[PDB]
Amino acid sequence: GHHHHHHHHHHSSGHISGDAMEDKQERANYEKLQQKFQMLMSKHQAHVRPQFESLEKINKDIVGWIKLSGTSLNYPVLQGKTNHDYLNLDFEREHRRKGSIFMDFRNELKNLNHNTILYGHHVGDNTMFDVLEDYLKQSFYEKHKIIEFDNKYGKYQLQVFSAYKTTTKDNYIRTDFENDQDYQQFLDETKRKSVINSDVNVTVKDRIMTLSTCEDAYSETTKRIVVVAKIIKVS
Ligand code: NI
Ligand code: NI
Ligand code: NI
Ligand code: NI
């Protein structure tokens, strides 16, 4: 008939059965929010501001939405005053190990900085940023070159051009650069590190978005997966 998932998923705790009740409840909350957002989008076909003004009623910290068709990446983007505000908090401001997909506290929304950074968990249960790992394969990249990114000030597409693995020590990412030479070096370095080949033209006149896995404090994880994309304005 008309099914969004392999199996039917109950949303009310009282009807959720089986193992991992909590995980299923967390999943239910995202499914509910995805539905609310999808209806908002289909309704405001000519704009994007109303969609987010509606989401802000839930939490003013919801500053965007990121979605990749055919994958589990379909979540609200949170932003706090630090890069750990939403590390272990969901969009309802409830404590959750996986937290939220969140934007670096330094980034602007109305007029994007040179490099906009989003962070998310990668626990390997096919949620949040687990999808970034799939980008390390050329086959997957080719079929998922465009990611949707929306915010109150516009609708964008992220044209993926680099995916690689690094350490968890690499904790300082620049949002803007001293000059074109440094930005050019960053772009060149980004393509150089990529384990996948891309034909995307990115120049110093362009803006990019960095998607990075992020781990819990005092975690054993040693590697991070990074995916970088060129930001394209849709409407
Ligand atoms: Ni079933
Ligand atoms: Ni269920
Ligand atoms: Ni049932
Ligand atoms: Ni608390």
Side-chain angles (χ1 to χ4, degrees):
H2 189 128
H3 306 302
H4 303 154
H5 312 288
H6 189 179
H7 295 282
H8 72 272
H9 307 329
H10 286 286
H11 287 346
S12 181
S13 67
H15 303 303
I16 292 181
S17 178
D19 301 303
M21 303 290 253
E22 269 183 292
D23 284 4
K24 290 178 181 176
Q25 182 62 74
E26 183 175 340
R27 182 178 62 184
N29 291 338
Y30 282 112
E31 301 194 327
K32 297 168 60 175
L33 193 64
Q34 298 167 340
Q35 173 57 41
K36 175 176 177 64
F37 185 63
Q38 187 175 182
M39 293 198 292
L40 288 172
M41 294 200 104
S42 63
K43 180 181 181 181
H44 303 299
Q45 307 157 56
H47 300 297
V48 66
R49 170 174 288 287
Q51 292 165 57
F52 286 82
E53 297 190 308
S54 175
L55 291 179
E56 288 181 2
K57 293 183 184 180
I58 301 174
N59 184 343
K60 53 181 170 178
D61 293 338
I62 297 179
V63 304
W65 195 283
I66 185 158
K67 182 181 183 296
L68 175 55
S69 305
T71 75
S72 56
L73 184 64
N74 187 7
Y75 307 102
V77 177
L78 290 290
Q79 181 181 52
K81 295 193 177 63
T82 75
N83 285 338
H84 66 266
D85 275 23
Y86 286 91
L87 176 61
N88 301 120
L89 282 180
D90 66 17
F91 69 86
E92 295 183 354
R93 285 169 176 163
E94 283 299 313
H95 285 292
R96 297 283 188 179
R97 177 201 169 188
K98 288 183 292 176
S100 310
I101 293 306
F102 61 94
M103 179 179 284
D104 189 286
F105 77 89
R106 294 168 292 169
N107 287 312
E108 294 180 53
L109 308 172
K110 199 170 185 295
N111 293 104
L112 302 175
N113 297 309
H114 283 70
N115 182 27
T116 300
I117 314 160
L118 303 190
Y119 308 95
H121 272 71
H122 174 212
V123 306
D125 72 337
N126 197 192
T127 69
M128 314 319 283
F129 273 178
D130 278 322
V131 68
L132 298 192
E133 188 182 11
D134 295 337
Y135 272 109
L136 297 172
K137 297 66 184 180
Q138 191 69 47
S139 301
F140 180 89
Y141 160 72
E142 292 301 338
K143 300 178 183 300
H144 301 275
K145 301 164 78 174
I146 300 298
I147 299 171
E148 299 172 54
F149 174 73
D150 308 302
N151 58 60
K152 193 163 65 183
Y153 311 93
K155 296 183 180 181
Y156 307 74
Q157 287 184 328
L158 311 180
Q159 185 168 37
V160 182
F161 70 84
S162 181
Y164 58 85
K165 314 185 70 175
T166 185
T167 68
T168 55
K169 319 294 183 175
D170 224 314
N171 280 303
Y172 181 69
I173 300 173
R174 288 171 285 185
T175 64
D176 296 284
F177 306 74
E178 299 173 301
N179 54 62
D180 289 356
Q181 289 67 283
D182 283 356
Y183 186 27
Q184 186 60 263
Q185 287 182 171
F186 185 82
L187 296 178
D188 285 344
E189 195 67 299
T190 295
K191 301 176 81 75
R192 185 275 290 182
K193 295 173 182 172
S194 187
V195 301
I196 57 176
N197 297 305
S198 179
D199 183 57
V200 179
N201 298 294
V202 194
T203 71
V204 289
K205 305 185 188 306
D206 298 326
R207 294 181 294 182
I208 59 175
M209 185 173 283
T210 296
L211 306 180
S212 175
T213 55
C214 179
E215 55 301 312
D216 298 328
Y218 293 104
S219 167
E220 291 289 53
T221 64
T222 66
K223 270 56 184 57
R224 283 184 183 171
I225 304 175
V226 180
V227 173
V228 190
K230 174 181 177 172
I231 295 180
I232 309 300
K233 180 92 168 191
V234 177
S235 61

